[PDB]
Design a protein around this ligand. Sequence first.
Ligand code: ZN
Ligand code: ZN
Lengths: 358, 340
Amino acid sequence: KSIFNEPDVDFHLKLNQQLFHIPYELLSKRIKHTQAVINKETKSLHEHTAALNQIFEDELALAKITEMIRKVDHIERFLNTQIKSYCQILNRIKKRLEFFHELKDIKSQGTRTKLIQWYQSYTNILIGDYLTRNNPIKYHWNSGVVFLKQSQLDDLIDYDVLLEANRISTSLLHERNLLPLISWINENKKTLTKKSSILEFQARLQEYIELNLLDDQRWSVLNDLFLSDFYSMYGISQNDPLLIYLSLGISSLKTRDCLHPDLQLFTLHSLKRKNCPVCSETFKPITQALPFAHHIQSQLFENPILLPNGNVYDSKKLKKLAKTLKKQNLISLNPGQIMDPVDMKIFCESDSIKMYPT
Amino acid sequence: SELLDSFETEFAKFYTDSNLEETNLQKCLDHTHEFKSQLKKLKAHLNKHIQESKPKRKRELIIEKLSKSQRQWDHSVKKQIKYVSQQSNRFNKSTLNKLKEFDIDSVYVNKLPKETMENVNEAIGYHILRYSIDNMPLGNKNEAFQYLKDVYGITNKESTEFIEMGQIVHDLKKGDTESCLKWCSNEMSNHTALSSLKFDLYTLSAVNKELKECTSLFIKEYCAAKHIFFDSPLFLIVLSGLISFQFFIKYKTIREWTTKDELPFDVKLPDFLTHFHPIFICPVLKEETTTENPPYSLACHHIISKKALDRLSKNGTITFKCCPVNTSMSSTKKVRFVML
Ligand SMILES: [Zn+2]
Ligand SMILES: [Zn+2]
């Protein structure tokens, strides 16, 4: 029961599931840290109170209790920080949940424009996440970060995991290839080597060194390896979704003739071909190297007409355009004249031939 | 449908009854707070006892109280953190069963060439310049072109018109007409719609359901007057891309790059993205007439493709079928369908 052809809401979630993983790993790191901190401080407090119990069996007890308080309040502040980060991550997921609940409400109910607005939001959310990925950092902020902040939808895109990847992968290829990548391995050696992936090895060899083994392209292969491990760690789906959508859309409406080889302006904008997105003015180089289309139904205008120019237009649209040109004082017509847009010409009404396209 | 509801129900378990703002670690924070308070009370009592001891069933209770406090604190903290860890590890067994059955990136075939990434960066420029121009702090009339060029990036001469559009639209949004009136009265084109716009905004000069119906009309009549576009050439393309996924995955699952030509599985998409170029299917050979093999009309007022015509007649012999009263290539003509 879709409106026109949009798929069921169960499909959009599976379409972009990276939006529900990169917050989740951030969420799980928090618990995996705040459990280790408690397991490291609880034994400390226990062994510490063992001393007091021994000492009772001598006003040093007040000193010991004061040290106990001075130790406990630090745990209190630590938990406070952890909770104020945990709640923020939860909010981040909940916003993206209600985003799709909005589409479900719209789809369960004219309303076509109330859905076009939603697809406008769904396109901005996506241009933002492509721009904040590959656009050089200024200092850190990018053009993507600015767009996300100033479109009032910063919650629905991380823009910090992606930005962190951009920082590392531009330092590994610029700035004399000064490497902070070691500062990323050292904080993540517990889970990276469980997968047993060869990243510390190549980083160590490159650090030692600084002719393929001395060539520059080792920088590029190192960068590619780091991106592979990062993306497979988080779930970022290493192809820009904007690129995927374009690579299908442009080949989905590239029909059989898109690259077909003051009064003039109005005439040549009165056509319905000077609107085609795929062959407009700046997508021709994109669309040159892409397949065309498949169609098993000849869709055509209803009542066609041929005139000596060689091309067939319509029966009524020509009449309405002739009247329009009559009511704006651009041309000088007469009772039976008719005008042809392409290669502007005037033909009599009886130089018109009906056609039957089977 | 079912997945979204079964997702919200599982997700709500992270929160307590309030549905918001009371996360599970509040238990740990409360327990540590209570533990500290108990130690402070015990410290005060011991201080008082020693102070008054200056010249026993008392100490044998305070020491046990300290022991009890530490047992309760560590036991409760461990139990609560264990429960929250298990809950977070069980929510994965509902974010995994569904959202890891697609692998979006497996659909990327016919990769977009690496040389043409400037053109994408101009389509993005145009879309940002058109749909979301007013939602930015710009400032002066022309001291914002530099800001555009400096932060985001500048498109071709189709930026001055959009700066003016954003300026007038924002001015009209603040309930201050008498600039849109001037703009309308200066461009005197099609008188009809312009006069209709003049009357509508004049009515606005005399609400929350009227602004949304006048800004749109002005936008339409400005885009149709300065000859640019009304919908971005990128939004429509992303729409068609979103529509073709279902058919592509259906073809993929039937199957178990493609003849360097027309991709298969004949995706169908709504009318307002199809009424651009006319597509015609030959009635005798069943093939879409291309730039080569263009359709011919054969004096019977029928249309057949040229190749089928040149196999109906070897070199054009008078064989005349299709009203059996056709004729050979002395009375046949070229056609081109224009969707006027
Ligand atoms: Zn086209
Ligand atoms: Zn016939």
